[PDB]
């Protein structure tokens, strides 16, 4: 078993799961589509930057 710790666990538990060699055989899929795109600008009235 690959034992991990859910450090923000609310009371107490353990959860056993499965993860095969394949990405389709998962149980729950997390599919990133657009990842951490930075958007920057300035406000011309004050030139201060917004990020």
């Amino acid at each position: 078993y690959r034992v991990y710790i859910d450090q923000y666990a609310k009371q107490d538990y353990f959860t056993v799961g499965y993860k095969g060699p394949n990405e389709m055989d998962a149980g729950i899929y997390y599919a990133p589509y657009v990842a951490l795109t930075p958007l920057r600008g300035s406000d011309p009235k004050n030139f201060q930057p917004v990020m």
């Binding site: 990405e23 389709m24 055989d25 899929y29 599919a31």
Partner: protein, 51 residues
């Protein structure tokens, strides 16, 4: 000013490609194909063979 829009999160709209924005989606991509696994056998060394 054109709003890309979002689907209704309804399976029907997602499959058909219906969005509420300007552009209408061709189709819901392809993430893979999931097939039931083929079980193993118990072999036949547990009883005589005698072909």
């Amino acid at each position: 000013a054109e709003i890309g829009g979002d689907h209704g999160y309804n399976a029907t709209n997602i499959a058909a490609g219906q969005t509420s924005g300007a552009v209408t989606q061709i189709g819901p991509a392809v993430m893979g194909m999931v097939r039931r696994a083929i079980p193993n056998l118990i072999a036949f060394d547990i009883c005589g063979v005698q072909p």
